[PDB]
Design a protein around this ligand. Sequence first.
Ligand SMILES: *[C@@H]1O[C@H](CO)[C@@H](O)[C@H](O)[C@H]1NC(C)=O
Ligand SMILES: *[C@@H]1O[C@H](CO)[C@@H](O)[C@H](O)[C@H]1NC(C)=O
Ligand SMILES: *[C@@H]1O[C@H](CO)[C@@H](O)[C@H](O)[C@H]1NC(C)=O
Ligand SMILES: *[C@@H]1O[C@H](CO)[C@@H](O)[C@H](O)[C@H]1NC(C)=O
Ligand SMILES: *[C@@H]1O[C@H](CO)[C@@H](O)[C@H](O)[C@H]1NC(C)=O
Length: 188
Amino acid sequence: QVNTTMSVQMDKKALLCCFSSPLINAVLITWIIKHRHLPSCTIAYNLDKKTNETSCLGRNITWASTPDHSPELQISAVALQHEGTYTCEIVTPEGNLEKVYDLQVLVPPEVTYFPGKNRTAVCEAMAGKPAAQISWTPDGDCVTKSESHSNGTVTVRSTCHWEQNNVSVVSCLVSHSTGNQSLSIELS
Ligand SMILES: *[C@@H]1O[C@H](CO)[C@@H](O)[C@H](O)[C@H]1NC(C)=O
Ligand SMILES: *[C@@H]1O[C@H](CO)[C@@H](O)[C@H](O)[C@H]1NC(C)=O
Ligand SMILES: *[C@@H]1O[C@H](CO)[C@@H](O)[C@H](O)[C@H]1NC(C)=O
Ligand SMILES: *[C@@H]1O[C@H](CO)[C@@H](O)[C@H](O)[C@H]1NC(C)=O
Ligand SMILES: *[C@@H]1O[C@H](CO)[C@@H](O)[C@H](O)[C@H]1NC(C)=O
């Protein structure tokens, strides 16, 4: 329930801090990783016996470094499969402690822009997470179509037409939390 929401972009490295203190007497540290559909996996470290185990092979999930006073999980390269709950269960001589992360994966859209026939322009934001928002300058008569994909990404495709014959150059803004992208299009 009490958790840290964390947003990480595709292909970037993510670091999930369990705690950072020389005072916490951790005997065993376990990360439990849960997904909506994908099966769960675990990385565990025995600080007493200096031994470790993993059921996360092929998921690019490891200990950032050997855990001591700053136990930290590392995702070397974030991918859609990484979205889920990351729970750090700490066993100390006094009892149990926990740190929960809710990891969200952001996918930047792949954009394209092009003029069409009869003073139309097309702006597309391919497979973004969340869906990108497309806006035009100046205002046109547009049709925007969004397609949700099974991986959680959304493709947005916009086609406009401008009445005013004083309009020769149009601008498309593709807004996204990972960064805005805009380009101007010369009408036919
Ligand atoms: C994390 O906390 C937020 C805000 O309270 C909540 O919306 C979300 O569902 C929680 N997630 C988990 C995995 O507990
Ligand atoms: C964890 O286990 C793997 C496989 O047994 C090992 O290669 C790795 O060095 C261990 N990690 C740490 C932080 O000791
Ligand atoms: C693991 O990450 C590396 C880059 O650090 C990447 O080349 C590889 O394809 C990734 N493997 C999986 C299964 O995600
Ligand atoms: C998500 O699905 C779309 C549509 O199949 C695909 O174009 C895109 O490459 C996928 N995204 C990722 C990050 O796998
Ligand atoms: C991206 O564009 C939107 C819409 O104009 C704006 O609200 C937002 O501040 C922009 N983001 C950045 C980082 O400039």
